[PDB]
Amino acid sequence: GAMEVEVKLRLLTAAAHLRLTTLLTPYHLKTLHQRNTFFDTPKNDLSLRRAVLRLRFLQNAPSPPRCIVSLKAKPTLANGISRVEEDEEEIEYWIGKECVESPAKLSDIGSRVLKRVKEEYGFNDFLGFVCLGGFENVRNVYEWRGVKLEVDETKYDFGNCYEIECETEEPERVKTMIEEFLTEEKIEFSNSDMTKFAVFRSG
Ligand SMILES: [Mn+2]
Ligand SMILES: [Mn+2]
Ligand SMILES: [Mn+2]
């Protein structure tokens, strides 16, 4: 896949998130509703091999909903900067939906990314796969000071988390730019030190 490098900062409270979104209002591009679902074997074969297989269902807040399969491999997250190999592919929404219900049907899709999962992790089909479940995320996208800010409200069972992400080839310079702004505006933040998937799996 391609290498995804992104700044990842946690907004520490719902208030911090609300204040930031209000401050960024004039820079708003779009709002996305995401439902993230995850698949693995019951033995956690992908997870133990540092891989995450996501089906993301996406909808704008014509706006057909969309399903994107993502394989993320060999992630690192340190100092508020994430780097991971990401391979993505759009598939038919109805097909994605059926796979959440019946994960063995991943075997019936004909997807490039799924073929890569088979080849690299050594499966001949997805008959032994299960859905780990998922979580919703509301992503506000802003075009601010030359970057694309993605401000996330992630809704888990146990409660909500809030983050700012920014995909960039200059994460140190962009992270400093964002941090200066948050500090000036007295927004409560820290580096994120867990992926959304890891938070989800920790309960
Ligand atoms: Mn990505
Ligand atoms: Mn991210
Ligand atoms: Mn990203």
Pairwise CA distance, residues 169 & 179, whole Å: 17
In the chain, the number of structural domains is 1
Other C-beta atoms lying within 10 Å of the C-beta of residue 18: 13
Short-list 201, 187, 174, 145, CA closest to 81: 174
Domain that holds residue 16: 1-203
Could you write out the three-class secondary structure of 77-139? EECCEEEEEEEEEEECHHHHHHHHHCHHHHHHCCCHHHHHHHHHHCCCCCCCCEEEEEEEEEE
Spatial CB neighbours of 56, under 8 Å, sequence gap ≥ 6: 34, 35, 36, 37, 67, 68, 70
State in Å: Cα 84 to ligand 3 middle. 9
Give the Å distance between the CA of 5 and the centre of ligand 1. Answer: 9
Residue 194: count of CB within 10 angstroms of its CB: 14
CATH classification of the domain holding 25: 2.40.320.10
Q: Quote the ligand 3 centre to 133 CA distance (angstroms).
A: 20
Distance 82 CA to ligand 3 centre (A): 9
This entry's atomic model was obtained through X-ray
Residues 147 and 177: their CA atoms lie apart, in Å, by: 10
CA 165 to ligand 2 centroid distance, Å: 6
- Those residues whose beta carbon sits under 5 angstroms from the ion ligand 3 are 6
Using the mean position of ligand 1's atoms as its centre, give its distance from the Cα of residue 86 in Å: 6
